[PDB]
Structures are given as C-alpha cells and as structure tokens.
Amino acid sequence: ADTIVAVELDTYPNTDIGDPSYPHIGIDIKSVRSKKTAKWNMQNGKVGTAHIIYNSVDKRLSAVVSYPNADSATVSYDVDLDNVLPEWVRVGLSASTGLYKETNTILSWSFTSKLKSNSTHETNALHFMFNQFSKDQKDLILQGDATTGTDGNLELTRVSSNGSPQGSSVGRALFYAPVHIWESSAVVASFEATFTFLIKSPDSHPADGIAFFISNIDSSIPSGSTGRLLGLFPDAN
Amino acid sequence: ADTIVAVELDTYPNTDIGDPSYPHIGIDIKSVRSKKTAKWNMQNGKVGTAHIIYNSVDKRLSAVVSYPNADSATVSYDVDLDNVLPEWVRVGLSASTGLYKETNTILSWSFTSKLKSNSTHETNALHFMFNQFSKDQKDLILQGDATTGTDGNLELTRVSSNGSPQGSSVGRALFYAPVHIWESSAVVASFEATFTFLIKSPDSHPADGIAFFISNIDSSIPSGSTGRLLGLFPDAN
Amino acid sequence: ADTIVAVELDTYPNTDIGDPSYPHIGIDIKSVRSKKTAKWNMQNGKVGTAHIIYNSVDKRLSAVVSYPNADSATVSYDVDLDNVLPEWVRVGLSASTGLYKETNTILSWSFTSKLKSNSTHETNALHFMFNQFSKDQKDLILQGDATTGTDGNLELTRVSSNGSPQGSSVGRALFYAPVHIWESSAVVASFEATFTFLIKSPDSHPADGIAFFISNIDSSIPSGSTGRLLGLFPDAN
Amino acid sequence: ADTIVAVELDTYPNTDIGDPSYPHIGIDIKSVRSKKTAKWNMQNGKVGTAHIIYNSVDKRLSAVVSYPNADSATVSYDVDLDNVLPEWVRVGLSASTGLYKETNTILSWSFTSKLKSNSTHETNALHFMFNQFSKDQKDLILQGDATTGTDGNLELTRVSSNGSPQGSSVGRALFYAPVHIWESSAVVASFEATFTFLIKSPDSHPADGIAFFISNIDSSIPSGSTGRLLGLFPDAN
Numbered sequence: 001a002d003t004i005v006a007v008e009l010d011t012y013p014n015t016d017i018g019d020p021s022y023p024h025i026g027i028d029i030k031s032v033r034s035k036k037t038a039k040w041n042m043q044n045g046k047v048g049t050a051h052i053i054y055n056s057v058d059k060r061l062s063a064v065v066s067y068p069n070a071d072s073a074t075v076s077y078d079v080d081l082d083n084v085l086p087e088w089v090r091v092g093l094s095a096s097t098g099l100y101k102e103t104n105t106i107l108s109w110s111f112t113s114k115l116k117s118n119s120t121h122e123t124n125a126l127h128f129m130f131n132q133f134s135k136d137q138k139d140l141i142l143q144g145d146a147t148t149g150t151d152g153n154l155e156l157t158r159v160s161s162n163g164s165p166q167g168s169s170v171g172r173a174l175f176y177a178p179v180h181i182w183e184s185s186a187v188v189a190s191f192e193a194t195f196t197f198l199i200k201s202p203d204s205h206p207a208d209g210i211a212f213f214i215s216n217i218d219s220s221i222p223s224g225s226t227g228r229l230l231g232l233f234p235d236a237n
Numbered sequence: 238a239d240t241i242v243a244v245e246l247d248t249y250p251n252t253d254i255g256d257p258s259y260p261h262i263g264i265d266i267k268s269v270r271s272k273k274t275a276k277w278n279m280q281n282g283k284v285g286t287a288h289i290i291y292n293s294v295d296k297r298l299s300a301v302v303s304y305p306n307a308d309s310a311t312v313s314y315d316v317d318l319d320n321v322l323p324e325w326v327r328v329g330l331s332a333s334t335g336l337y338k339e340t341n342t343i344l345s346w347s348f349t350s351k352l353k354s355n356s357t358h359e360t361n362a363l364h365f366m367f368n369q370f371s372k373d374q375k376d377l378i379l380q381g382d383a384t385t386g387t388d389g390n391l392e393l394t395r396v397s398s399n400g401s402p403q404g405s406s407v408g409r410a411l412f413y414a415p416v417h418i419w420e421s422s423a424v425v426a427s428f429e430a431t432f433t434f435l436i437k438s439p440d441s442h443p444a445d446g447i448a449f450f451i452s453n454i455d456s457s458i459p460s461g462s463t464g465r466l467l468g469l470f471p472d473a474n
Numbered sequence: 475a476d477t478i479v480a481v482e483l484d485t486y487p488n489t490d491i492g493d494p495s496y497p498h499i500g501i502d503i504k505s506v507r508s509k510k511t512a513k514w515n516m517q518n519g520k521v522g523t524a525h526i527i528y529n530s531v532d533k534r535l536s537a538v539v540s541y542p543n544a545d546s547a548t549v550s551y552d553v554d555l556d557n558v559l560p561e562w563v564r565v566g567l568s569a570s571t572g573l574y575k576e577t578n579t580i581l582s583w584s585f586t587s588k589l590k591s592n593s594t595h596e597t598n599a600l601h602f603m604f605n606q607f608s609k610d611q612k613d614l615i616l617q618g619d620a621t622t623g624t625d626g627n628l629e630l631t632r633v634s635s636n637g638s639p640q641g642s643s644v645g646r647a648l649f650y651a652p653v654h655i656w657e658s659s660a661v662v663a664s665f666e667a668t669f670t671f672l673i674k675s676p677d678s679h680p681a682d683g684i685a686f687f688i689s690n691i692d693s694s695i696p697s698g699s700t701g702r703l704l705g706l707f708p709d710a711n
Numbered sequence: 712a713d714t715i716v717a718v719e720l721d722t723y724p725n726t727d728i729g730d731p732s733y734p735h736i737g738i739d740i741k742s743v744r745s746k747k748t749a750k751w752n753m754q755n756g757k758v759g760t761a762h763i764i765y766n767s768v769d770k771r772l773s774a775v776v777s778y779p780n781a782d783s784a785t786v787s788y789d790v791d792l793d794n795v796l797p798e799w800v801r802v803g804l805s806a807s808t809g810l811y812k813e814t815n816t817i818l819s820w821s822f823t824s825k826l827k828s829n830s831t832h833e834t835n836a837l838h839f840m841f842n843q844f845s846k847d848q849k850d851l852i853l854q855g856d857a858t859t860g861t862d863g864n865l866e867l868t869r870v871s872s873n874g875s876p877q878g879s880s881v882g883r884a885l886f887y888a889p890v891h892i893w894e895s896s897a898v899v900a901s902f903e904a905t906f907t908f909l910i911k912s913p914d915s916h917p918a919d920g921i922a923f924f925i926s927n928i929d930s931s932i933p934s935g936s937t938g939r940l941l942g943l944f945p946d947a948n
C-alpha cells in the first residue's frame with residue numbers, strides 16, 4: 001500500500017467518515033480522517049492560495065489557505081516525517097469529484113526542499129516553480145483525469161469542452177524527480193510548497209476537494225478513490 | 238532603550254544572573270536572562286554552524302547549533318515577534334569577552350526574509366550571503382571591536398596580531414539595510430539565518446559568547462556591555 | 475561628478491542631443507547619448523517588463539523590454555564594468571517628464587547579484603524583490619518626486635491626486651544597501667535586474683522615460699535634470 | 712542518434728582527431744571536434760571549479776574553469792540552442808579514461824534554469840544543488856561506471872579501493888527530471904551550471920576528461936565511447 005501524508009482542502013463535508021460539518025483544511029497522515037482540521041471559508045469561483053511548510057527542528061507541519069482581502073485558515077500538526085515517510089518520496093497535487101462537482105484548477109505550484117548534512121555549507125536542494133503548464137509538460141507525471149495546457153493551467157479533474165466540471169473524476173500530478181525528504185545525518189531539513197487554485201462549482205454543493213501530498217515514489221491513484229477519497233486513499237478507514 | 242531579540246551561544250555560565258551552570262544556547266527576548274536555553278557542548282577550536290528560523294504561522298523561534306560528527310543543540314520558544322519588535326529592524330551578530338576570552342570569528346553568514354501580502358505571488362524578499370568578508374565591507378555596519386578582512390573573516394571581538402583573543406572586548410556587525418520583519422496585512426512572513434563560527438580559547442575558560450540579534454534600526458552597543466552582557470544589554474535585569 | 479551606467483527606456487526622441495527619431499531603449503555609459511540603442515514600440519497604458527543582465531565572463535550588458543503578446547526590444551553592449559564603475563555602487567530606477575508627461579509607475583522590481591571569488595562555493599550574494607511598495611519603505615532611498623504607497627506602487631514622478639501625470643518632474647529610488655558590483659579576485663560576477671512598469675500618457679507625446687541605473691553610492695539627482703536628462707545626467711554631453 | 716551539446720574539460724590532446732596539442736576546454740555541438748577551445752592549465756590533484764552559462768538574449772554559451780589562486784580558462788561560442796536541441800532535454804556530467812587515466816571526481820554540482828514566457832512574473836524555474844552524493848541517489852541516473860557514496864562524492868569513472876583510477880572507463884550522471892531548455896513563446900530563457908572536480912592522475916598522462924552536457928531525454932552512453940569520445944560521441948567525426 002502507499003504511504004500518504006497530505007494537506008487537504010476539503011470542500012465537501014462527509015460527516016459520516018469523520019469530516020467536520022463544514023468545508024475545512026486538514027492534515028492527513030495515512031488516512032482520509034485528518035489528524036487535524038480547521039474551518040475553511042472556501043470562496044466559490046475565486047483564486048486562492050495555499051502555503052505548506054515543515055522543518056525537522058520543530059517537527060510540525062503547517063498550512064495556510066487564503067483568498068485576497070479575506071481571513072486565512074491555518075492548520076498545524078506535530079509530526080516527525082522521518083517516522084512516517086520513506087527517505088525518498090514524490091510530491092504532487094490531487095483532486096476529485098463525486099456526485100457533486102467543482103473545477104480543481106491549479107494556476108501555479110512551487111516547491112523547495114533543503115537538506116543540510118554534517119558539513120560546511122553542505123546543503124542539497126531542490127526547487128521547481130510552475131506558473132504556466134504546457135501541453136507537453138514532461139517533468140510532471142499526470143495520473144487519472146489530470147491534464148495540462150488548457151489556458152496554461154493544470155486541470156486535476158475532468159472539465160468538459162464548455163468548461164463545466166464533471167462528477168466522479170480523479171486526477172493527480174506528481175513532480176517527475178524523487179525528493180529526498182529526510183536523511184538520518186541531516187542537521188536541518190525543510191520543505192515549502194505553494195500553489196494557487198480556482199475552485200468553481202455551478203451545481204448545488206462543491207466537492208470534493210484538492211490535496212497536496214507526499215508519497216512513496218511509485219504511488220498511483222487507488223482504484224475507485226473518487227469522491228470523498230480525494231484520489232489518495234483506497235478506503236475511508 | 239533598544240528592543241532586542243537574540244539567540245545566544247553562551248560559552249560562559251554566569252549562574253549569578255540566571256545562566257545554567259553549563260555552556261548553552263538561548264532565546265533572549267529583551268533581557269539577557271534567556272526565556273529558554275538548552276545545553277550546548279561547545280567544542281574549543283572547531284568550526285560550528287548555527288541555524289535560526291521563524292515563521293508567522295507557528296510563531297515559534299528555533300535554533301540548532303552543531304559541529305560536524307557531533308550531536309546538535311536545539312532550542313525553540315513560542316513568540317509572536319509582531320508584539321515584540323517594530324515593523325522595520327536591523328539584523329546582526331554580536332560577541333564579547335570579559336576576564337576570560339575566546340575568538341569570536343565568523344566565517345560565513347546568510348539571511349533570507351520573505352513577506353507575502355494579500356495578493357497573487359506578491360512576495361517581497363531580502364537575501365544576502367557572506368562567505369568572504371573584505372577589508373572594506375560597505376554593506377555591513379561594524380560596531381565596537383568588530384573588524385573584517387583578516388583571512389576573509391569577520392572578527393567580532395579584538396584579536397591581537399599574533400592571533401590571540403583579548404578580554405573585555407565587544408563587537409557587532411549589522412547588515413546595512415533595514416529589514417521589514419513583519420506587516421499587519423502579511424499572510425506569511427518568515428526568516429532564516431545561518432552562520433558558521435570559530436570559537437578558540439587559549440585561557441582557562443572560554444567567554445563570553447556569540448549572538449544573532451534583531452533590533453531597532455538605530456541600535457548600538459550599550460556602554461560597558463562586555464562580558465556576560467554580550468554587547469546587547471545595558472544590565473542583567 | 476557621479477559615474478552613471480544606465481539602461482534607458484526613452485519614450486521621447488530629442489534628436490537635438492543624439493536620440494534616434496523614435497522611442498528606443500539604450501545603454502548609457504556616463505553620458506545621455508547612448509552607446510547603443512534599439513527601436514522600442516512603447517505601448518501607452520500597458521504594463522511592460524524589462525530585464526537587464528550582465529556577467530564578467532562575456533563583459534556584455536543586455537536588456538530586453540517587452541509587453542505581453544508583443545515583440546520585444548533587445549539591446550546589448552560590450553562593456554567591462556570594472557573599468558567604468560567603482561567596486562561598491564548603488565542601484566536604482568529613475569524617471570522624468572518635461573514639457574510632455576507620462577506616468578512612470580513601477581509595479582515590481584527585483585535584483586540579484588553574485589560574486590564568486592577564488593574559493594570553494596565561496597559566493598557572496600545579494601537579492602531583493604519588490605512586488606508591493608509600502609508607504610514607509612525604509613530599504614529604499616527616494617529622491618526627487620518619487621513616492622511609494624499609491625496602490626502599493628512606486629511612482630517615480632509626480633502624479634496628481636486624480637492620477638494625471640505632471641510635467642517637469644524627476645524622481646529616483648535606490649536600494650538602501652551598497653552593492654559590491656565587482657572585485658579583482660572574483661572568478662565570476664553577475665547581476666540580474668527585472669522590473670515591470672506602466673507608462674500612461676494623456677497628452678500629445680509621452681516623455682521622457684524610465685531608466686535602470688548603477689551609480690556611485692552617494693549619487694543624487696543633478697540640478698535641473700528633468701526632461702531629456704532622465705534625472706541622471708547634469709548635461710547633454 | 713543523440714543530440715549532444717557539451718562543454719568539455721579535455722585533459723588529453725588527441726591531435727589526430729582535431730584536439731589542440733595541449734589540455735583545453737571546449738564547446739562541442741554534436742561532434743567531438745569542438746567548435747571552440749581555449750588552453751587550460753589543468754592542475755593534477757587540485758580541486759577546480761567550472762561555471763557554464765547561457766541566455767537566449769545573447770545566444771552565447773560561455774564557460775570558465777579555474778583553480779584557487781590561479782588564472783582561469785574561458786571559452787565562449789555563439790549558438791542558438793533552439794535550433795540545436797529539442798524543447799525538453801536532460802542535463803548531466805560525463806567522464807572517460809582510456810590507455811591513460813585519472814580520477815573524474817565530482818564534489819558538487821548545481822544547475823538553475825529559468826523560462827519567462829509572455830506574462831507577468833510568469834517564470835517557470837528548476838534548480839537543484841548537490842554538495843553531497845549519497846549511496847542511494849534516486850534523483851540521478853547513473854550510467855556506465857559512475858557511482859555515488861564514495862566519501863559522499865560522485866565518481867564518474869572507475870576507481871579502485873586504494874583510490875587509483877582505472878583505464879578504459881566511462882560514466883555519466885544525468886538529473887532525473889527532464890529540463891525545459893526552451894520554448895518558442897519565451898521572452899527570456901537562461902541556465903547556469905556549476906560543479907567542482909578533482910582530477911588526479913598517477914600515471915604518465917592524465918586522460919581523458921570531464922564534460923557537462925545537455926542531451927535528448929533518452930540519451931545513453933554510445934558503444935565504445937571510452938577514451939577520447941568522453942562517453943558522449945559514437946565516433947570522432
């Protein structure tokens with residue numbers, strides 16, 4: 001099975017599987033039932049921004065999601081990723097729709113990771129920044145319904161030609177190169193992730209959400225994980 | 238008076254004023270009596286590295302000081318700098334000697350600060366990296382006994398021609414430009430500081446230490462702040 | 475007696491002093507009479523972007539000015555800055571108006587400079603990025619009519635309350651810290667400058683232009699340098 | 712066949728195939744016979760540094776190779792990479808030995824690539840920095856005799872237990888993710904490469920050299936490319 005650590009931007013409450021009775025952001029550690037959540041006042045049709053950060057000194061994973069001229073939603077959870085994830089992982093974005101839909105458009109995405117080992121200035125680093133996505137984005141592994149090129153944007157889930165969002169859709173984009181998330185002999189290790197999105201929903205309720213995730217290198221979308229599973233988990237356990 | 242927030246690498250225990258009975262690292266918030274300290278196994282004559290980090294999401298200031306092939310010392314303290322420091326500050330390094338001495342040589346120093354406001358990718362940032370210090374380092378404000386140029390290093394305190402450290406010395410180096418440490422309308426704000434040092438002590442005990450500090454723009458060495466005061470505080474209150 | 479090296483975005487042709495008969499961009503080395511120019515199809519009322527780059531290996535100063543979905547204007551000139559400028563300089567933006575006007579609005583400005591000396595990874599660097607300008611921008615030295623805060627932008631020249639541009643206006647913005655542009659023992663040295671602007675002109679012709687400049691630390695606006703002198707030169711020599 | 716653009720650090724002159732009669736650095740565009748070379752005073756047993764740069768404004772590829780307290784070797788060639796290389800490529804380091812040998816040790820390697828298309832601050836970037844190489848370096852594709860982990864270094868060619876170099880050896884290291892080297896709608900595009908090496912040769916003459924290269928994504932070591940072919944070319948044409 002895949003080892004998943006994700007920060008979810010959950011637009012649809014599934015109170016039956018542990019979701020809060022309102023849209024929220026949460027920290028998922030190997031389960032869709034977030035170890036921590038915070039109320040999120042999602043704004044339909046508006047471009048928002050998410051920022052996720054973590055460092056081995058504090059061993060705390062935090063995220064802030066906000067819209068311009070609007071209060072932000074913050075969520076933090078104490079977790080030592082050395083004990084949860086493998087040394088080498090892959091990072092990506094995931095999204096899904098179920099009975100209800102919304103567009104899960106990504107306008108930009110950047111990530112920076114640094115590892116300092118026991119030596120002078122000996123820091124290994126990785127950084128990538130996407131502001132425009134091309135039709136042939138070779139450095140991205142697109143899974144499921146995810147597609148690039150539409151207006152230079154990344155469409156995680158299926159959107160028809162007339163621009164309307166489709167139900168029962170799942171899609172992910174993983175950066176091509178494996179990321180060395182930690183090392184036993186590292187003094188300091190940290191990562192920063194930032195992405196802007198546009199969740200637009202024409203129907204009754206928006207669903208199901210977007211999630212930033214870290215996984216084992218060979219991770220793939222679990223079969224049937226549309227809807228509430230965010231394309232990350234095989235079941236709601 | 239000056240508003241000081243510093244991370245001290247205290248090599249000499251002054252138990253009479255609140256120091257632990259062993260070398261330690263500490264977080265000083267407007268007073269030399271650290272709000273938080275951690276035992277530090279200082280290694281005489283060896284190059285060490287210090288890393289300090291802070292972000293407005295967690296509102297926690299942390300630091301790690303280590304030597305190669307050696308366990309590190311970590312210290313963290315929850316503090317909202319918005320309520321402590323002014324919006325515009327100056328960052329620097331400070332060091333002192335008293336009856337007992339040590340060299341307070343800085344081999345490198347880098348700093349990165351970022352402020353994200355309520356707007357798309359609207360991030361203001363400042364970054365500087367010093368690996369070599371020249372005889373005429375115009376972007377540094379040297380105070381007291383601090384001098385640059387000797388072997389491309391920054392000597393915070395007085396070191397004789399023969400290379401031996403002098404007692405009763407104080408010196409600081411502040412980066413020339415004021416730093417916008419925070420702003421009421423910032424979504425995220427963070428800073429990272431890193432510096433390598435070389436503390437060498439020929440005499441009985443090493444004293445007194447090095448400190449990374451953030452202060453009011455016009456800060457200056459208080460008179461008589463050699464020894465235990467680290468060139469940062471006027472008294473031991 | 476300032477030593478000036480600037481890249482001009484000349485919106486008004488003053489053929490009487492050497493300007494081409496059309497808007498152009500040029501490389502000015504101690505004189506308003508560009509050593510090199512290129513036709514520039516300036517677009518009234520549109521946000522444009524300028525990029526300047528230089529490296530000691532090629533000893534060539536290049537710039538590209540473009541507007542979205544439009545052809546760019548490029549200008550390059552072979553010049554060894556070690557022979558032209560002092561070791562320590564200051565960098566800034568300048569703008570002026572005369573009988574004719576235009577707004578010289580700066581929306582963003584970033585600069586990065588690196589110096590690699592004869593040592594392993596021993597690089598000294600400086601980087602600052604401005605996407606938003608505040609009312610109290612302490613790390614900037616505003617000269618002449620330059621002001622910050624207006625909609626988070628940098629207005630180099632005088633703009634009325636209603637927004638209309640004023641004639642006979644000069645203004646500059648220099649970054650607070652001195653920049654080590656070069657060093658005799660440097661293997662490689664390079665710098666990159668990028669800024670976006672908005673030149674809007676209601677009157678007959680736009681005038682006079684914007685310029686990115688490098689100067690001696692203590693440089694200041696020459697008396698009477700409004701109009702064709704761009705706030706950089708004392709005369710048309 | 713592979714499309715190769717490389718900067719060679721040729722330690723062994725093969726005059727019979729066009730090599731100058733002295734160690735040299737060169738720019739190879741699809742052939743082992745450099746379009747441009749420069750005399751290089753290689754220092755046996757000393758750590759050196761190589762810096763390569765390119766930008767679409769000047770369309771010139773330059774490189775500087777130097778040793779501390781020593782004069783550098785510079786080589787530049789005017790070439791538009793849009794006409795030579797495909798849009799997506801892979802970057803790496805290559806080295807070889809033949810009848811004569813040397814160690815082709817890489818101590819560090821960093822790369823930065825940026826593409827700015829027709830849009831505000833819309834820049835796509837990639838940056839990776841390697842100061843330490845681990846035994847299980849997953850983000851690198853090791854070809855031939857290349858190995859990592861030995862003292863945290865990258866040994867491009869075969870070296871024994873006692874550290875001595877082996878003859879008739881070839882090896883390469885390519886970064887895992889494909890690099891978008893160019894795009895038809897990009898205003899500016901640039902890349903920078905830096906790496907430190909240690910060429911040590913116990914035998915009569917050092918051979919054959921190290922090279923930084925850009926190639927088609929699926930490139931692999933040509934059959935029989937040991938010796939003078941630097942593991943990049945199938946023949947000496």
Ligand SMILES: OC[C@H]1O[C@H](OC[C@H]2O[C@H](O)[C@@H](O)[C@@H](O[C@H]3O[C@H](CO)[C@@H](O)[C@H](O)[C@@H]3O)[C@@H]2O)[C@@H](O)[C@@H](O)[C@@H]1O
Nearest residue numbers: 012013014015016097098099100207208226227228229
């Ligand atoms: O796209 C949203 C949703 O679609 C699919 O589920 C449809 C409905 O399925 C079950 O009926 C319910 O889970 C329902 O959820 C509502 O009712 C629950 C029980 O009353 C309650 O606990 C929930 O909080 C909610 O009010 C679903 O709407 C499927 O794709 C889901 O995975 C997906 O989340």
Ligand SMILES: OC[C@H]1O[C@H](OC[C@H]2O[C@H](O)[C@@H](O)[C@@H](O[C@H]3O[C@H](CO)[C@@H](O)[C@H](O)[C@@H]3O)[C@@H]2O)[C@@H](O)[C@@H](O)[C@@H]1O
Nearest residue numbers: 249250251252253334335336337444445463464465466
């Ligand atoms: O450079 C070290 C120290 O030098 C100067 O003080 C010298 C001594 O001054 C006082 O005697 C004491 O504070 C002493 O400290 C020792 O004794 C204390 C009392 O027994 C004890 O609490 C301390 O922990 C320590 O054992 C000093 O050594 C002066 O410049 C000081 O500022 C400076 O720290």
Ligand SMILES: OC[C@H]1O[C@H](OC[C@H]2O[C@H](O)[C@@H](O)[C@@H](O[C@H]3O[C@H](CO)[C@@H](O)[C@H](O)[C@@H]3O)[C@@H]2O)[C@@H](O)[C@@H](O)[C@@H]1O
Nearest residue numbers: 486487488489490571572573574681682700701702703
């Ligand atoms: O703001 C533009 C301009 O305003 C001020 O000069 C106004 C006029 O001053 C002089 O008459 C001329 O230089 C004139 O320039 C035009 O005519 C010239 C002669 O025919 C010709 O060489 C020029 O190319 C141009 O067509 C100006 O219009 C003063 O502030 C100037 O510095 C400023 O550039």
Ligand SMILES: OC[C@H]1O[C@H](OC[C@H]2O[C@H](O)[C@@H](O)[C@@H](O[C@H]3O[C@H](CO)[C@@H](O)[C@H](O)[C@@H]3O)[C@@H]2O)[C@@H](O)[C@@H](O)[C@@H]1O
Nearest residue numbers: 723724725726727808809810811918919937938939940
């Ligand atoms: O590692 C060096 C070299 O080893 C292998 O070639 C060995 C020799 O092969 C041929 O004899 C020659 O090319 C010789 O080169 C010398 O002599 C040439 C003719 O006089 C002269 O042009 C050359 O400049 C050189 O002095 C080689 O030494 C094989 O692996 C080669 O690929 C490899 O370069």
Ligand SMILES: [Ca+2]
Nearest residue numbers: 010012013014
């Ligand atoms: Ca849900």
Ligand SMILES: [Ca+2]
Nearest residue numbers: 247249250251
């Ligand atoms: Ca003390």
Ligand SMILES: [Ca+2]
Nearest residue numbers: 484486487488
């Ligand atoms: Ca003019």
Ligand SMILES: [Ca+2]
Nearest residue numbers: 721723724725
């Ligand atoms: Ca050769």
Ligand SMILES: [Mn+2]
Nearest residue numbers: 010019026034
């Ligand atoms: Mn949830």
Ligand SMILES: [Mn+2]
Nearest residue numbers: 247256263271
């Ligand atoms: Mn103390």
Ligand SMILES: [Mn+2]
Nearest residue numbers: 484493500508
């Ligand atoms: Mn002109």
Ligand SMILES: [Mn+2]
Nearest residue numbers: 721730737745
């Ligand atoms: Mn050659």
